[PDB]
């Protein structure tokens, strides 16, 4: 395809420095939807506000973490089926967490977002598509542990 080279091109300019870019995603995803910000609690406790998260060492590990399954889903961008069972398992999990299915449109827009603001006149309209397209395909499969 055309669309998997625009995702690796794309990829590899935010792939440089995944915690920065993470970083803007998540503070992105509060902005939008700060009923998340309780469901990262950490030893216990909740972050107050946003830029709370910022100072907790594992709200950073998640941020890697993301950022690490996202290059994952790009390098098998041409075969997502191999993630699947992976992916639905972190499905799984994150039901487990508390998270509502609808919330991972939020982290889409997120992501479209930081990949906007990053490329800039590169994030092209089939840029936008190409990626809109295999995020949705991670959700798809994720979407399978909240069993349906
Ligand atoms: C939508 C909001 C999200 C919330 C509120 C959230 C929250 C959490 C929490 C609380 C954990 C367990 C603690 C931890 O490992 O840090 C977790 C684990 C994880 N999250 Fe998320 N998460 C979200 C989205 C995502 C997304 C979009 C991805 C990947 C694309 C992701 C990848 C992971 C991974 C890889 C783990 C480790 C799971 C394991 O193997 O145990 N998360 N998340």
Do not use: C
């Not at 998540?26 to 030893?43: G, H, K, M, T």
């Not at 910022?54 to 041409?78: C, G, Q, W």
């Amino acid at each position: 395809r055309p669309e998997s080279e625009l995702i690796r091109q794309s990829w590899r300019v935010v792939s440089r420095s995944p915690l920065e870019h993470g970083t803007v995603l998540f503070a992105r995803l509060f902005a939008l939807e700060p009923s998340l910000l309780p469901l990262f609690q950490y030893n216990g406790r909740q972050f107050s506000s946003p830029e709370d998260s910022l100072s907790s060492p594992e709200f950073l590990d998640h941020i890697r973490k993301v950022m690490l399954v996202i290059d994952a889903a790009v390098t098998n961008v041409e075969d997502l089926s191999s993630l699947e069972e992976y992916l639905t398992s972190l499905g799984r999990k994150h039901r487990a967490v508390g998270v509502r299915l609808s919330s991972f449109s939020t982290v889409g827009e997120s992501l479209l977002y930081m990949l906007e603001k990053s490329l800039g006149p590169d994030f092209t309209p089939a840029t936008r598509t190409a990626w809109s397209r295999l995020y949705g395909a991670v959700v798809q499969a994720m979407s399978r542990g909240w069993d349906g």
